[PDB]
Design an enzyme around this catalytic site. Structure first.
Site, PDB file in Angstrom:
ATOM      1  CD  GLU C 104      16.661 -13.129 -27.548  1.00 25.34           C
ATOM      2  OE1 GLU C 104      17.792 -12.626 -27.193  1.00 25.34           O
ATOM      3  OE2 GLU C 104      16.411 -13.438 -29.061  1.00 25.34           O
ATOM      4  CD  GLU C 134      16.545  -9.676 -29.024  1.00 23.57           C
ATOM      5  OE1 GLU C 134      16.364 -10.778 -28.512  1.00 23.57           O
ATOM      6  OE2 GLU C 134      17.664  -9.373 -29.697  1.00 23.57           O
ATOM      7  CG  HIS C 137      13.716 -14.724 -31.247  1.00 21.16           C
ATOM      8  ND1 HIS C 137      14.422 -13.584 -32.152  1.00 21.16           N
ATOM      9  CD2 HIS C 137      13.562 -15.663 -32.227  1.00 21.16           C
ATOM     10  CE1 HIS C 137      14.637 -13.995 -33.314  1.00 21.16           C
ATOM     11  NE2 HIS C 137      14.000 -15.052 -33.559  1.00 21.16           N
ATOM     12  CD  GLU C 186      22.621  -9.058 -30.130  1.00 22.16           C
ATOM     13  OE1 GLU C 186      22.636  -7.905 -30.167  1.00 22.16           O
ATOM     14  OE2 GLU C 186      21.351  -9.553 -30.798  1.00 22.16           O
ATOM     15  CD  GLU C 220      20.963 -12.306 -33.175  1.00 23.92           C
ATOM     16  OE1 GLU C 220      21.680 -11.514 -32.829  1.00 23.92           O
ATOM     17  OE2 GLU C 220      19.887 -12.669 -32.869  1.00 23.92           O
ATOM     18  CG  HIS C 223      19.981  -8.512 -33.498  1.00 28.29           C
ATOM     19  ND1 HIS C 223      19.773  -9.573 -32.779  1.00 28.29           N
ATOM     20  CD2 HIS C 223      18.854  -8.021 -34.305  1.00 28.29           C
ATOM     21  CE1 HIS C 223      18.235  -9.775 -32.903  1.00 28.29           C
ATOM     22  NE2 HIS C 223      17.759  -8.957 -33.616  1.00 28.29           N
TER      23      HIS C 223
HETATM   24 FE    FE Z   1      20.632 -10.969 -31.435  1.00 28.47          FE
HETATM   25 FE    FE Z   2      17.985 -11.867 -29.264  1.00 27.15          FE
END
Ligand code: FE
Ligand code: FE
Ligand code: FE
EC number: 1.14.13.25
Lengths: 167, 339, 503, 68, 339, 75, 64
Positions: C104, C134, C137, C186, C220, C223
């Site tokens: 992360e 990121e 997290h 990912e 996500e 992302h």
């Molecule tokens: Fe991610």
């Molecule tokens: Fe991540």
């Protein structure tokens, strides 16, 4: 046999001869030889493999302090520590790279330019945009038909001494 | 605080070995070549505000929700009725919008900073510093779209502000400063120091605080202070962290202090000139403004400028030993006053 | 009249209203382009899937954190009371959280690089939003790991981890880094991974990883949109037809080289309870779902399935069992406590990987017999390895360990010598990477850093000893009895060789 | 009101529901408990939407089972 | 919110029988004797904001924390330096502090309302409206204390504001109105309606918005707008609730609508009269502020008065059928204007 | 937080019943009585706020008014 | 003037005399967890014990 990772006798003695550099020209020539000798795959010797990265730092620090101690702002901004006009360096190495006839000619030009002109030799801004423009050309050439050469021929192209090939 | 997998050949790193994979050419994942400044510990920086995601996002949320409640109540009040119409259409709509382009450029200077800088707390401060700046830009546009909803015929499109930011001489020197700080260098300490500590603390403070916020408070603009209050709060929060990084951590590094001050002074010299130019071009805007005695004329403008450069001297210049003659800098800019 | 008449209906400004004009915030100047070396130009008109301005970002995320942090605290206090989690998963947790934080953090800088690569304000915004995610997290991981630094750099898995989680994200063409991060990292591995770990962890009584991982799962989709927009923003560039599929294939191979054996080791050896065997999982995630369906739908933009997908499949059958051999053989270099498969573990293994018992089953049995777990045995199974001609090598490119004499996988040793240095490579795709690009791949492996040193001094220098001062963090068992100290390792008299000395 | 453009119901029992929608580039799914939104996710395909929702639900149901 | 144990002899109840305990002499725990107004159902009102405790304190918390961030940044900016020292010391400090008593008085009037009224949602709306008013009072004092920290010799004590509120003729009309609405009646619909719908919507709106907020953005004051934004947002939130109760529920009750309008019109006549008086006293303040064309001359005040009274006609008068001649009310107030 | 914990707590009581049935009933009585008391306490504390002369003592009763309001809203 | 009245592996509890009342507090793993008041010291301890019984019942259940 080996010594500790972060503090050992090699790094100590090298910091010893590094302290004694007393001029921008002495330090410049010191760092260029050192980089040439110990960094890259085209390095002269893997003797200092485990220690050259730390040692390079120490040279970089010594050279950079000497740069602030003895040089003018205009030299800090516009000249490499070799005496050259930094812009002229950038033009000249980009021009060399655009003329390379092959990815192997390119990779050598790029590797050497970093070996000779990595900060604190070139001004950081001039260095980073030159590095980047060379990387572009080097990737554009290397990533063309990237899987066309078979592995056997690629080994020859690299000039590798095949010590072993599991069956 | 210490997540970045930095080796011992970068000041502060605790790992060992070369990177697992580098750039074509050999550029390291992170490396000392990324900046001209040096230090014994790149992890020393601490945001004086302790801003991490949970507090940083919390605070911005508060300001987001309050902003909408305040707008709903403001349109209900009808308080836009006493705004001076020339200021609103000729100066605010147009030149305060062009400043959105200015703040936008400062936000994008952070993009390479967030990739290249060498410590997690510096990456964290850099990102929030840059997010606030795009906030500034978005907020100016939010104001214009709001006024557009109260005032028929008020065009909140960005076309005119963009034409003004790209072609109008008032902002030529600004646009030049921002374009060099954003897309013209890559030393990430130089981007942060030139952008917040020199350019933004002189021109940016002049344009936001001395011109649009101050003047809104003499032209009966009851709306724009709600917005510059946020930009000004964000400036001071960011100044806090910039100060810790460049003054306490770098210009006073126990070993490279004098080294770092040399580069800081050189930088400050270069971008103080760029700042003076931007101001000198910018001060021509007063030619289009109704006169007010302590504010919109030469005596006042000189006082405003005296505050920017004087404050900047005590807050940045004197801390790194950079010599400035406030009086001269003020004169240099007033040469552009054109009245 | 201005001073009297106006519309006094309540109105604010909603975010999509400010987002409508975001694209026009950028302006044309000649120097206005990314600072990084790239073969591609992300197109200036590309759009963002979500119309989120800074204030709206803060509002949405402040709200999630409100209850998510509350729920996380409750999970940490409940786990602070009882035995709770099964011991074996208890160890896998510490590794999962430590690896997640690395990824992360580095993702923050990969996303910043991508924001620099884009020229459309909207695509910059999309990347920017992942930067901020990121960050959020890594801060969650700081909090987590705060309850549970130079001690993880000691091991041999940490290095491969650092390629697919850190260097692969930030060092290369930004497009290639996008493929490492979003399009493969990912989309193919970690997004499926975090939902699956939610079930496995929960079945072992771990409440914390499901909480953290579901919070990550909330983000996500943004992302995966970033990954998609990378490909879309470059699909009209002629560089794309020339290059995109090589960058994709190479980055797919980088990611699968570590995660194919790594994750399978995690699931099947780091948990007692087994949801389903990793090889069936692998073929569902990578081969069918990612490689079949998803990459299939990207063909619209000239994306082709990695040419190396079939080699990757061939290796997915035994790679994680091979890796597990290496991890078990080297436990003193790690930072967690291992558990040899028990009697039903073995049953399950044989059941699902016919041949497991004749091979790995017997090795681990013999290691148990020779004193694997007994701290009075002075036995280190890496020594037994060398002492029976079972050398361990390290892929110069991927860093993944390779044991050719014991490996049932699909990798083969290539030992080359270049300009006075011997290199070991272990498959056809890594070897092309290193032959094409020696200067990208100079990572020292541990046999080089620790050559001819005793095992115990390497551990001790690394701080891999408890507050005790003599008891190792690493342990060959998970019971609270008969713990290994530096002295017990030193008794073994283990000294690192140079595995390439014989060539 | 389900169509080829709509979202699709992939789980329904006494307490939990889960939906999924095709968004071209990805599939978006959500899980509801007693009618209230609980959790949001995404997958590469309808197929992995189902598998994903099944993992998360196994976790939720284990939580419920542990409250008795 | 049907939790107040009301019996079927109070409009909308479900319980039965007398109270278990009454006042000496026999006053019920709650009864229709508490108000002139009547209705089919007292639990009909719904706050349009549906601001219960959780959201009401959430929003005020955001404002509270943002306020302190804004102050710490505003002191760092030095923005106090461009304010008219006169406005600062002789108008703001003295007459704005006096305004705090007006707000404090309005807060207290809700104490009997909180006790007496007949529905639990009305009890909630009233208490929050109370809280906002005392908040207003405390926020004015907060700003005074802030200026005292920056300009030396600036006295933030309440002594002078209190003397001005209790004895200065500029505020006599106001203090009378507040004293009457707070301590001179106990009909809890009359307190709410006279307090918020009539007095505070004419005089309070003129004093907070038209004088201190508007004039601050004519005299260079960049601090005060931050504080009026809070009280003006708060005024608009409360008007949402006040309008729902008295216009939807009460003035249009299916059975007592007309009944309630008689009293509503009766109240408005009386308290509109006190409001005009209060405005007429107040406009004297212009005789001590510097003259600024369009803001402090007779045409500026007139136009301000036209906004307050014209707004009030639309927002309230027309909705219960109370006839106001806006020009006549304005000319009534201006009779106290010197120029 | 208290609202977060009440939520997480409130889903668990739901899928089955962990509470002994006798106390299950007692909860219903306790929560009805609580609601009435907290509601009337609002008006009681307003009467006391009316009784005090000192603005500080007024303020103290006002804080309790808001407190009783807060908890009715949890009910 | 804080008085420690409970201390074990995980929980700590203090009371203090404020003349009109006694204010107590409970810490779990050094984290302030719960505030309360009682008429006296004795009723502080009985109150703290009641809550600690609830917190520990939660700890028991979240393992078995
Ligand atoms: Fe991610
Ligand atoms: Fe991540
Ligand atoms: Fe109570």
């Amino acid at each position: 046999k080996r010594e500790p990772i972060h503090e050992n006798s090699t790094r100590t003695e090298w910091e010893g001869k590094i302290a004694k550099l007393n001029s921008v020209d002495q330090a410049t020539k010191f760092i260029q030889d050192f980089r040439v000798a110990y960094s890259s795959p085209f390095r002269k010797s893997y003797d200092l493999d485990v220690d050259y990265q730390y040692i390079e730092r120490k040279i970089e620090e010594r050279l950079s302090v000497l740069k602030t101690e003895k040089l003018s702002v205009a030299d800090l901004v516009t000249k490499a520590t070799t005496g050259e006009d930094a812009a002229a360096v950038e033009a000249a190495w980009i021009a060399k790279m655009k003329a390379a006839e092959s990815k192997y000619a390119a990779e050598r030009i790029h590797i050497e330019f970093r070996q000779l002109y990595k900060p604190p030799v070139l001004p950081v801004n001039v260095f980073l945009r030159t590095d980047a423009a060379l990387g572009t050309i080097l990737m554009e050439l290397r990533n063309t038909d990237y899987y066309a050469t078979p592995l056997e021929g690629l080994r020859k192209e690299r000039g590798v001494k095949v010590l072993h090939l599991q069956a | 605080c210490y997540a970045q997998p930095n080796p011992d050949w970068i000041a502060g790193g605790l790992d060992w070995g070369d990177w697992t994979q580098k750039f074509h050419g050999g550029r390291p994942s992170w490396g000392n070549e990324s900046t001209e400044l040096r230090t014994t510990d790149w992890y020393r920086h601490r945001d004086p505000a302790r801003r991490w995601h949970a507090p940083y996002v919390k605070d911005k949320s508060e300001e987001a929700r309050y902003t909408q409640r305040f707008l709903a109540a403001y349109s209900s009040e009808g308080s836009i009725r006493t705004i001076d119409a020339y200021w609103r259409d000729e100066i605010l709509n147009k030149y305060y919008g062009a400043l959105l382009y200015n703040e936008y450029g400062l936000f994008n200077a952070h993009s390479s900073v967030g990739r290249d800088c060498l410590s997690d707390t510096i990456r964290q401060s850099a990102t929030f510093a840059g997010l606030d700046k795009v906030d500034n830009a978005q907020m100016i546009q939010m104001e214009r779209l709001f006024i557009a909803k109260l005032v028929p015929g008020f065009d909140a499109s960005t076309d005119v502000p963009k034409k003004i930011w790209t072609t109008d001489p008032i902002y030529a020197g600004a646009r030049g400063a921002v374009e060099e700080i954003w897309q013209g260098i890559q030393d990430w300490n130089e981007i942060l120091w030139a952008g917040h500590a020199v350019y933004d603390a002189t021109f940016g403070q002049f344009a936001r605080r001395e011109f649009f916020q101050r003047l809104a408070t003499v032209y009966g603009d009851t709306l724009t202070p709600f917005f510059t209050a946020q930009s000004q709060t964000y400036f001071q929060t960011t100044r806090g962290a910039i100060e810790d990084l460049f003054v306490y951590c770098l210009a006073n590094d126990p070993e490279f202090g004098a080294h770092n001050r040399t580069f800081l002074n050189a930088w400050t010299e270069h971008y103080l000139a760029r700042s003076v130019t931007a101001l000198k071009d910018f001060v021509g805007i007063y030619a289009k403004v109704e006169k007010v005695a302590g504010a919109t004329d030469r005596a006042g403008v000189s006082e405003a400028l005296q505050r920017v450069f004087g404050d900047w001297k005590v807050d940045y210049a004197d801390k790194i030993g950079f010599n400035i003659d406030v009086d001269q800098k003020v004169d240099a800019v007033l040469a552009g006053f054109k009245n | 009249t201005d001073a009297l008449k106006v519309n006094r209906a309540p109105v604010g400004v909603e975010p999509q209203e400010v987002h409508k004009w975001l694209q026009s915030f950028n302006w044309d100047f000649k120097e206005n382009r990314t600072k990084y070396a790239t073969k591609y130009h992300m197109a200036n008109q590309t759009k963002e899937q979500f119309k989120v301005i800074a204030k709206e970002y803060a509002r949405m995320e402040a709200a999630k954190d409100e209850r998510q942090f509350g729920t996380l605290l409750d999970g940490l206090t409940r786990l602070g009371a009882g035995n709770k989690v099964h011991p074996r998963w208890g160890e896998t947790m510490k590794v999962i959280s430590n690896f997640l934080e690395v990824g992360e953090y580095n993702a923050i800088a990969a996303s910043a690089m991508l924001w620099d690569s884009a020229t459309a304000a909207e695509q910059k915004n999309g990347y920017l939003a992942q930067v901020l995610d990121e960050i959020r997290h890594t801060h969650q991981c700081a909090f987590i790991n705060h309850y549970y630094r130079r001690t993880r750099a000691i091991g041999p898995l940490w290095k491969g981890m650092k390629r697919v989680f850190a260097d692969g994200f930030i060092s290369g063409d930004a497009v290639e880094c996008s493929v490492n991060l979003q399009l493969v990292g990912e989309a193919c591995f970690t997004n499926p991974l975090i939902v699956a770990v939610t079930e496995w962890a929960s079945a072992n009584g771990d409440e914390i990883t499901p909480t953290v991982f579901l919070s990550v799962e909330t983000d996500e989709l943004r992302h995966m949109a970033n990954g998609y927009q990378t490909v879309v923003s470059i699909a009209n560039d002629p560089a794309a037809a020339k290059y995109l599929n090589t960058d994709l294939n190479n980055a797919f191979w980088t990611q699968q080289k570590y995660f194919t054996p790594a994750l399978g080791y995690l699931f099947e050896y780091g948990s007692k309870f087994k949801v389903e065997p990793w090889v069936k999982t692998w073929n569902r995630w990578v081969y069918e779902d990612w490689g079949g369906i998803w990459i299939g739908r990207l063909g619209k933009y000239g994306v082709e399935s990695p040419r190396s997908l079939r080699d990757a499949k061939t290796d997915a059958y035994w790679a994680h069992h091979d890796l597990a051999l290496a991890a078990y053989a080297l436990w003193p270099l790690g930072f967690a406590r291992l558990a040899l498969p028990d009697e039903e573990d073995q049953e399950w293994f044989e059941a699902n990987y016919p041949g497991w018992a004749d091979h790995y089953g017997k090795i681990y049995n013999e290691w148990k017999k020779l004193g694997y777990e007994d701290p009075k045995s002075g036995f280190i199974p890496y020594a037994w390895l060398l002492a029976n001609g079972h050398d361990v090598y390290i892929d110069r490119v991927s860093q993944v360990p390779f044991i050719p004499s014991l490996a049932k996988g699909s990798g083969s040793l290539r030992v080359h010598e270049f300009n006075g240095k011997k290199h070991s490579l272990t498959d056809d795709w890594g070897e092309r990477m290193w032959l094409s690009e020696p200067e990208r791949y100079e990572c020292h492996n541990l046999f080089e850093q620790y050559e001819g040193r005793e095992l115990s001094e390497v551990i001790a220098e690394g701080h891999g000893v408890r507050s005790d001062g003599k008891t190792l963090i690493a342990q060959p068992h998970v019971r609270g009895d008969n713990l290994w100290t530096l002295e017990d390792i030193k008794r073994a008299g283990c000294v690192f060789p140079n595995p390439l000395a014989k060539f | 009101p389900t169509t080829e453009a709509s979202r699709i119901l992939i789980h329904s029992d006494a307490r939990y529901e889960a939906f999924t929608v095709d968004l071209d580039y990805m599939w978006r799914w959500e899980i509801l408990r007693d009618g209230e939104f609980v959790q949001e996710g995404c997958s590469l395909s309808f197929d992995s939407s189902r598998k994903a929702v099944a993992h998360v639900l196994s976790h939720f149901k284990r939580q419920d089972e542990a409250a008795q």
